Coordinates of C-alpha atoms and ligand atoms in Angstrom, one line a residue:
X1 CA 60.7 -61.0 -11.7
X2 CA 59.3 -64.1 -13.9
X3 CA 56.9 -67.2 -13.1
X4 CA 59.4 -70.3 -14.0
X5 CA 56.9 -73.9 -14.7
X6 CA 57.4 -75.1 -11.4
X7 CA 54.8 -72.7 -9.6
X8 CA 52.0 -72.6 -12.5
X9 CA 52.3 -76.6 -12.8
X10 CA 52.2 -77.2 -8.6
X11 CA 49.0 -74.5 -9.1
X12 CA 47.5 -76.8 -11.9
X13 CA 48.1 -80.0 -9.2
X14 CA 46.0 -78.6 -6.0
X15 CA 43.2 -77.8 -8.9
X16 CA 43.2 -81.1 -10.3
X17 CA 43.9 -83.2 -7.5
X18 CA 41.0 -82.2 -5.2
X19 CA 38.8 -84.8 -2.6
X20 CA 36.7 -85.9 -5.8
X21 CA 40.3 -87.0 -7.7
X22 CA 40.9 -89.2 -4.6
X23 CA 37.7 -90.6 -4.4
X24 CA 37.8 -92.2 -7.8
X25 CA 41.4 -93.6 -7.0
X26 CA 40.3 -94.9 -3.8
X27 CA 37.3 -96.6 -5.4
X28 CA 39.2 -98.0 -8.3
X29 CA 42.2 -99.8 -5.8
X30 CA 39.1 -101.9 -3.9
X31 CA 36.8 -102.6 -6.8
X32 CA 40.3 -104.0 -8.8
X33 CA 42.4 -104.9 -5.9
X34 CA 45.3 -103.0 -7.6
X35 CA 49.2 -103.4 -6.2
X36 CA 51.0 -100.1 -5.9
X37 CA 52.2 -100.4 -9.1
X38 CA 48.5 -100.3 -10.6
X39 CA 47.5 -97.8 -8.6
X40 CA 50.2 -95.8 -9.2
X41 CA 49.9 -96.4 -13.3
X42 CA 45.6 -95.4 -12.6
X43 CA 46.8 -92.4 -10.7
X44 CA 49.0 -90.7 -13.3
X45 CA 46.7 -91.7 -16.2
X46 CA 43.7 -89.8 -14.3
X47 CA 46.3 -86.4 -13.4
X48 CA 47.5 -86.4 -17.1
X49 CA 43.9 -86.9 -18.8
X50 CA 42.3 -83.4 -16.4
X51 CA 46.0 -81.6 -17.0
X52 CA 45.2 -82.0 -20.7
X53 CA 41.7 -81.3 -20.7
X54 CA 42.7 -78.3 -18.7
X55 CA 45.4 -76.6 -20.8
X56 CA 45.1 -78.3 -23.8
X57 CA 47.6 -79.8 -26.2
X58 CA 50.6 -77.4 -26.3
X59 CA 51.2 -76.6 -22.8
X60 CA 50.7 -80.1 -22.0
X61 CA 53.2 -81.7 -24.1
X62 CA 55.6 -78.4 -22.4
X63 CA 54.6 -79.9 -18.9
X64 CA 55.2 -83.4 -19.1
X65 CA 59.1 -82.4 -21.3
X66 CA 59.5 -80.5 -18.4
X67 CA 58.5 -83.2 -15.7
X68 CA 60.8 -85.6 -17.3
X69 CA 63.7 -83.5 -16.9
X70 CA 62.5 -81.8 -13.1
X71 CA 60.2 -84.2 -11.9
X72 CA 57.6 -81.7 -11.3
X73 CA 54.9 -84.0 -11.5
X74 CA 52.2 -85.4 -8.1
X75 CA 53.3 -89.0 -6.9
X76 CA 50.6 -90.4 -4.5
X77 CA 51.2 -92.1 -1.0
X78 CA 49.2 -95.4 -0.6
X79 CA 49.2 -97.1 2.9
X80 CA 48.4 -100.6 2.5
X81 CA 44.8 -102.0 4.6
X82 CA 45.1 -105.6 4.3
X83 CA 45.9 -105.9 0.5
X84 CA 43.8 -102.5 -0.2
X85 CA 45.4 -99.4 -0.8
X86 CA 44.3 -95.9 0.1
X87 CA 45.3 -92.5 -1.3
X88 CA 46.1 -90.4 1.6
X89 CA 48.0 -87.7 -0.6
X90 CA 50.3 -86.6 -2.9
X91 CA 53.8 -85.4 -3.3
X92 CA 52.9 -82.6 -5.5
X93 CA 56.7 -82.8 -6.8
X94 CA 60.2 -83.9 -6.0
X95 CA 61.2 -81.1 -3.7
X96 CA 57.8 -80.5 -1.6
X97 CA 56.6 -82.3 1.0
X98 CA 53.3 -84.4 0.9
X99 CA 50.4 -82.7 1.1
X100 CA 47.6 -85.1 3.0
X101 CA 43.7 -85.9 2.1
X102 CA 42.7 -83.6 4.7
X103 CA 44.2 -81.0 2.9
X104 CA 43.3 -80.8 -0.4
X105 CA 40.1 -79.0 -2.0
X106 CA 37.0 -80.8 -1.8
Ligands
CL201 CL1 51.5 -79.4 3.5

């Protein structure tokens, strides 16, 4: 009956990537102007620093071995207003569909 990554890791996502998450990302694209690329980089370097300071070291080196062979880790969805992206959501991995802004915890 056993609880494979995908579920605890997808679990850890909605925890870490709440209203407040978004906020900062949001904030962050207009103060720097940042292409999607940037944005992007800024978004994973903010999920990976709460995932570590969440499970610590071990699992998290687990989690991102097993992301790069399942691809089990958030992608964001910008929308582009005039040169300044917004987060609207997340793809909280490869095989679910987006969950938007309006949906996640505050
Ligand atoms: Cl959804």
């Amino acid at each position: 009956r056993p609880l494979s990554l995908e579920t605890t890791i997808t679990s850890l996502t909605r925890d870490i990537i709440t209203h407040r998450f978004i906020y900062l990302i949001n904030h962050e694209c207009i103060v720097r102007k940042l292409d999607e690329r940037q944005a992007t980089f800024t978004f994973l370097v903010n999920y990976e620093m709460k995932l570590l300071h969440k499970v610590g070291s071990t699992k998290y080196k687990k989690y991102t071995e097993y992301n790069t062979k399942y691809g089990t880790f958030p992608m964001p969805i910008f929308i582009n207003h005039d040169g300044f992206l917004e987060c609207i959501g997340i793809k909280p991995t490869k095989h679910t569909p987006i969950i938007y802004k309006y949906d996640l915890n505050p």
